């Protein structure tokens, strides 16, 4: 019937918006990802600089000697 079909087109509308979800959300997932991978490269930097402070300290002490 007619009113049934009107609001059934409404349900079709809700289906198409969820199709929009299906098209958008995972792209959001793998755009969050690489930000984090760069942050892991940043972990690598942090480890490097851990190594670096001690070197600086021993260098300055031997400079004093």
């Amino acid at each position: 019937g007619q009113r049934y079909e009107t609001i059934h087109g409404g349900l079709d509308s809700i289906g198409r918006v969820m199709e929009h979800l299906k098209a958008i959300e995972p792209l959001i997932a793998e755009i969050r990802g690489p930000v984090s991978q760069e942050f892991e490269a940043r972990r690598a930097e942090h480890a490097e600089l851990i190594a670096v402070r001690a070197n600086l300290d021993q260098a300055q002490r031997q400079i004093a000697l």
Partner: nanobody
Framework: LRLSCASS????????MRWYRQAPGKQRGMVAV???????NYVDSVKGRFIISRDSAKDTVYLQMNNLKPEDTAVYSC?????????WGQGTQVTVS
């Protein structure tokens, strides 16, 4: 049928580096390996197929496509490892046939 990358600095002061293949709709995959030694190996799929070579001078590494069957069609990205870190570039793609 021949592809390369350049590092920021310190080629051969850069230890192990390798290349990776990204077939579409699939996840990451290693391709071939050069070392600081020039010691080299490939993955079984591309064994015999691809050839890799290092130029010590101009801060670079080389991959040359060979006798390719379209199945290898993918987007490739060249990788390197430095004092325990990842190093990834932007990569580039290869096509059918």
């Amino acid at each position: 049928l021949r592809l390369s990358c350049a590092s920021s600095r310190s080629i051969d002061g850069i230890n192990i580096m390798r290349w990776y293949r990204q077939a579409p709709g699939k996840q990451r995959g290693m391709v071939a390996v050069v070392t600081g030694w020039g010691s080299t190996n490939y993955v079984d799929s591309v064994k015999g197929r691809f050839i890799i070579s290092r130029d010590s001078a101009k801060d670079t590494v080389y991959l040359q496509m060979n006798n390719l069957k379209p199945e290898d069609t993918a987007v490739y990205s060249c990788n390197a490892i430095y004092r325990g870190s990842e190093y990834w570039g932007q990569g580039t793609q290869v096509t059918v046939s």
